[PDB]
Amino acid sequence: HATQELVTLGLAKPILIGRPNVIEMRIQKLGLQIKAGVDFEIVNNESDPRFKEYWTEYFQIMKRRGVTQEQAQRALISNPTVIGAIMVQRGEADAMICGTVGDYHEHFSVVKNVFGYRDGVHTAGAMNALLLPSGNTFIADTYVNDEPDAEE
Amino acid sequence: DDQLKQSALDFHEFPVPGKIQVSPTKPLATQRDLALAYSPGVAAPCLEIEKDPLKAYKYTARGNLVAVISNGTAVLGLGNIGALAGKPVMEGKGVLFKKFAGIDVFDIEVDELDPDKFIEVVAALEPTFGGINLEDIKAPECFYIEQKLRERMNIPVFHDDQHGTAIISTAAILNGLRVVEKNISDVRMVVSGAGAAAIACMNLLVALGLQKHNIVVCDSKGVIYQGREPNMAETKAAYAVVDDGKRTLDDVIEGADIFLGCSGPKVLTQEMVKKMARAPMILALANPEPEILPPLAKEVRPDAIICTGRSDYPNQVNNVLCFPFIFRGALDVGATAINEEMKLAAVRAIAELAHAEQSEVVASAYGDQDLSFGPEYIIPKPFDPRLIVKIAPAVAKAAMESGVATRPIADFDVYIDKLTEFVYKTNLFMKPIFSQARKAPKRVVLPEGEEARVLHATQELVTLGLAKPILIGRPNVIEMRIQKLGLQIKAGVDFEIVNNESDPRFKEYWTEYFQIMKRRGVTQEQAQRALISNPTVIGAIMVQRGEADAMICGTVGDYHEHFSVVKNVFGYRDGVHTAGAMNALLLPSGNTFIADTYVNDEPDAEELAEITLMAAETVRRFGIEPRVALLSHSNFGSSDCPSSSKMRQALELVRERAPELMIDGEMHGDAALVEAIRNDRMPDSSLKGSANILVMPNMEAARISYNLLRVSSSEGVTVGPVLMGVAKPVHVLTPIASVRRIVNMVALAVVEAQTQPL
Amino acid sequence: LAEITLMAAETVRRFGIEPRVALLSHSNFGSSDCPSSSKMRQALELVRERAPELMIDGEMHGDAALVEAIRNDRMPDSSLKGSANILVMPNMEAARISYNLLRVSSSEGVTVGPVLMGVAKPVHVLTPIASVRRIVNMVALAVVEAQTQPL
Numbered sequence A: 001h002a003t004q005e006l007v008t009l010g011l012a013k014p015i016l017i018g019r020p021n022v023i024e025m026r027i028q029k030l031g032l033q034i035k036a037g038v039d040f041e042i043v044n045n046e047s048d049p050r051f052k053e054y055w056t057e058y059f060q061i062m063k064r065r066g067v068t069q070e071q072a073q074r075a076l077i078s079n080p081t082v083i084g085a086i087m088v089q090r091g092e093a094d095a096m097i098c099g100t101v102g103d104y105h106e107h108f109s110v111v112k113n114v115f116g117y118r119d120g121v122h123t124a125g126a127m128n129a130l131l132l133p134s135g136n137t138f139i140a141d142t143y144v145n146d147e148p149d150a151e152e
Numbered sequence B: 001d002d003q004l005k006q007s008a009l010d011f012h013e014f015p016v017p018g019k020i021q022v023s024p025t026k027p028l029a030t031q032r033d034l035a036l037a038y039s040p041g042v043a044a045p046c047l048e049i050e051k052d053p054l055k056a057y058k059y060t061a062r063g064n065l066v067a068v069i070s071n072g073t074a075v076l077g078l079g080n081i082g083a084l085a086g087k088p089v090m091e092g093k094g095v096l097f098k099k100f101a102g103i104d105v106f107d108i109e110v111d112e113l114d115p116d117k118f119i120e121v122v123a124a125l126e127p128t129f130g131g132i133n134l135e136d137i138k139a140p141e142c143f144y145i146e147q148k149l150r151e152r153m154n155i156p157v158f159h160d161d162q163h164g165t166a167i168i169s170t171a172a173i174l175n176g177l178r179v180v181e182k183n184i185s186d187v188r189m190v191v192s193g194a195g196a197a198a199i200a201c202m203n204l205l206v207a208l209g210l211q212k213h214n215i216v217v218c219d220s221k222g223v224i225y226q227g228r229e230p231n232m233a234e235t236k237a238a239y240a241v242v243d244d245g246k247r248t249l250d251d252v253i254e255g256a257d258i259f260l261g262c263s264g265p266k267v268l269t270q271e272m273v274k275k276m277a278r279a280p281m282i283l284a285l286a287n288p289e290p291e292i293l294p295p296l297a298k299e300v301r302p303d304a305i306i307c308t309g310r311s312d313y314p315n316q317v318n319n320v321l322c323f324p325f326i327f328r329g330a331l332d333v334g335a336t337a338i339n340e341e342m343k344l345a346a347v348r349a350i351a352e353l354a355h356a357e358q359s360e361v362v363a364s365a366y367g368d369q370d371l372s373f374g375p376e377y378i379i380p381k382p383f384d385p386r387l388i389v390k391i392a393p394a395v396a397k398a399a400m401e402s403g404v405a406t407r408p409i410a411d412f413d414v415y416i417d418k419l420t421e422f423v424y425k426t427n428l429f430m431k432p433i434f435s436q437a438r439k440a441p442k443r444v445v446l447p448e449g450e451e452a453r454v455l456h457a458t459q460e461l462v463t464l465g466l467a468k469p470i471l472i473g474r475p476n477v478i479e480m481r482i483q484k485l486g487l488q489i490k491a492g493v494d495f496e497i498v499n500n501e502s503d504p505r506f507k508e509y510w511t512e513y514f515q516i517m518k519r520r521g522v523t524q525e526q527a528q529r530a531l532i533s534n535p536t537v538i539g540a541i542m543v544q545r546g547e548a549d550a551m552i553c554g555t556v557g558d559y560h561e562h563f564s565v566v567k568n569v570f571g572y573r574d575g576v577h578t579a580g581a582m583n584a585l586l587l588p589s590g591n592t593f594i595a596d597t598y599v600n601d602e603p604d605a606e607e608l609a610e611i612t613l614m615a616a617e618t619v620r621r622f623g624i625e626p627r628v629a630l631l632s633h634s635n636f637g638s639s640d641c642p643s644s645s646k647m648r649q650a651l652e653l654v655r656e657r658a659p660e661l662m663i664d665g666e667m668h669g670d671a672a673l674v675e676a677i678r679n680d681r682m683p684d685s686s687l688k689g690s691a692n693i694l695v696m697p698n699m700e701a702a703r704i705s706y707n708l709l710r711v712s713s714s715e716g717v718t719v720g721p722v723l724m725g726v727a728k729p730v731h732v733l734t735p736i737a738s739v740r741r742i743v744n745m746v747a748l749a750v751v752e753a754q755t756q757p758l
Numbered sequence C: 001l002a003e004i005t006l007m008a009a010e011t012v013r014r015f016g017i018e019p020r021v022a023l024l025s026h027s028n029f030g031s032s033d034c035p036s037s038s039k040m041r042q043a044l045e046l047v048r049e050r051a052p053e054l055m056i057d058g059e060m061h062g063d064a065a066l067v068e069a070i071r072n073d074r075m076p077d078s079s080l081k082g083s084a085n086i087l088v089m090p091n092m093e094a095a096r097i098s099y100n101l102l103r104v105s106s107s108e109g110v111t112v113g114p115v116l117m118g119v120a121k122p123v124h125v126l127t128p129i130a131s132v133r134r135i136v137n138m139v140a141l142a143v144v145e146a147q148t149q150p151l
């Protein structure tokens, strides 16, 4: 639904990750008017033509972080967040929006491992916005650091 | 027959050619040691040998060394392929000499095939060897050559099968006559196919106190009796009965009592067995095809005493029965030859064993020994921990009785002690597990069904009939990988495939996973995603539901990624609050098990005690008596670190729980493994001999020690990591596990599922 | 750990053997995040800082360190070539247990040990079970070390 809205408003060029068959049947059942290639690009998690170059980069990132070559191969087929992060890091996409499935830190660990921290920054935080009677209010680090210290 | 032809063609020569590797049993890692071995320093042992030849067996080989000396004329069952060309099965015979009794075998093969120059070459090579194991000398020059050779050397000249199985055969006769409450005086015999190992067997069979006129020798050409041929056949006319017009074998029975024969195809029939007297004692020893088809004859007549030489049935006559152990009696006594008393007192040991077999740490579970003396049990099974400590001392005792030995053994208590010590360090507990799994296969999930190693293991398990595999993966990828690998397994026919996607039981699977893990951080959508992308979860849910009996995972990913799923689904065993992984090693001291190499990073005293008890129980089920030693960097209170105090607390807890368990600690690894160091440190230690279970303070020490010892000091793979303390049978393996490891662990899981898989 | 690694490499170099160090742990190249493995990785970084020419890698398993095929399967780009001849262990319990088990199981003869490194003057504390050959070898090593400014 969000992809349909983004195509309609022309806000982004979506790159969906999943099985094209399941995506298409779900689109038809939902009643959307988006089509593969025409409006949004589909990247198949399996039988991806760039599979070899993807798991290779993931392994080179995570070889000394507990990930073997076979684990890298298995992650680039069963972990869509890793595929999206490698896509963004390589340059085939500009941004990623994950987290709609699973736990927050399951995706944040991949994001931090691939992209890393910003320059001059040694911590990450998640800001949540609320519309209170006093106005727009933002609460800092609702998701990342369990017990930040003074510097964090 | 490629599943046997190609598999046996895949021979373990790849690392280094030849099963034997003539290697220094002494250290050679220093110029001092090298000078002691080849420079002045090695002249002294040789000079002392030359001064008095009594030192020949002492300073060198030729004490334990036999040489299976051959002209390659009857290579086990092959024939005259040649001396050098016989090397494959030459080494195959020589390898079940060291494997089962520690006999050194120099596979020197005489190239001289003439029946009179062969003896000349063998007697020329006599000083190299302290007892020759003459094999592959063919008939009829086997008897001729052995008869010539026996009279020359002053060291045990013991042929192979020609002298051979007579010990096992006459022991089987002595027990069979016991079974049917008969006596050797009136027993009648029928012999067929007087071959290399046949015509020489009744000669021993007579030595029990047997009249010659009761034996009827036969060959391919009818019946060898006195009156048949004008020229009486040698070594057979003594037994030859008077002429009576009996020209066909089907009538020469007349109610006989024994069918001792070592020959080829069938000669005996069912009506022939019917013509036999009451309580027939058919002893068809043909290896290719039994001469009577024992099931058919047993359906024809009951209370049969059928004895064969194949291991598929009890009462098997192998060389390992006494040949390595004969020389363990022959060479280890100092005899100058082997008499008929040697050949007859070892008859009174293996025959004694069959009706005197008991205890000997029977595998508490697994194994399924179920051996009782009777019509289906005449002689012990091929491989036995006391097939040595009873047969070898019998041969030595016969040596002193014959007064032909040169190094008579002292008080036999010490001899039996050393022999039993050698027994502890050579155990084959996996063969009973394979035998017990094969007679009751179970369904085992292999969640990593697309792995080449798992597919090879599946082929092996289908071939051996150990399990009913249930592979998990994409059927398409599995099938293409099978075709590429060259396997002969098919979906449904040999192994069931469970597709991780589009599984008909998807709804009922993720529902159960959610009900297990709803309050453990897993949502319904996460449960749905796990039952499609996590094969371990699918296999665990399958096993928990009851659609499979065991699981074997871990060949991909991290150990704890699978162990967390296993623990979450199955839980812990009743009365058990911890889990541990036991890894097995074949050390020079014997089978050694290291406890909790994978599960607990830093176990405490109670967890260590539970792990110790579970490891002892598992090792007991293997058929090995548990000898536990808690390991630490402190030797019996040397250090007061919390680790050593924790080890002492665990020792006290274990002693409370299991007073019968042999355990001590905390000590060093060398103190645990060698008894001299421990006796020097703790003379009153409750641990006797070498410890076979090593319990370590933390997972780092256990894992590092196991990894270093496996690649440095280890022979082969048996089992590991054996997961203990989980409710249902499941073993998490490692990504580097070999096909043999997977097959062994699947067989272990199958046998554990035969024992209430919960 | 870094100081011990450097001293061990220097001593093995003085023996005439090219040092090939491998820091050992129950984790294979970041598999576990226990403080022990993090300490091993920190030691590896410190050693690489101090001695860029030393051939060292870690942290890995014992089999990965000793056989090159396992390491190449795990880390094809490992800085360690062949078998490691220096094994640095996370704690004294693991080191002592591994050495004691390997000495009685997988070992040919005695050469030296325990070689004490980091003390001002040549001195070697032995064990009560040290043999005559061990004492002679260790005395010879101490004599040769005293020929090299015994301070």
Ligand SMILES: NC(=O)c1ccc[n+]([C@@H]2O[C@H](COP(=O)([O-])OP(=O)(O)OC[C@H]3O[C@@H](n4cnc5c(N)ncnc54)[C@H](OP(=O)(O)O)[C@@H]3O)[C@@H](O)[C@H]2O)c1
Binding pocket: B074, B076, B077, B138, B139, B161, B165, B192, B193, B194, B195, B196, B197, B198, B219, B220, B221, B262, B263, B264, B265, B285, B286, B287, B288, B309, B310, B317, B318, B319
């Ligand atoms: N421990 C064991 O399990 C064991 C050990 C050794 C041998 N064996 C078995 O014994 C056989 C050969 O062993 P071996 O080397 O001792 O003997 P061998 O030298 O091969 O002689 C076998 C004899 O069988 C006879 N024979 C062949 N075909 C026959 C037929 N159709 N009818 C009757 N007799 C026939 C031949 O006698 P003629 O010369 O008169 O034809 C021949 O001399 C094989 O079956 C082998 O598996 C078993």
Ligand SMILES: [Mg+2]
Binding pocket: B074, B075, B076, B077, B093, B135, B136, B160
């Ligand atoms: Mg043979």
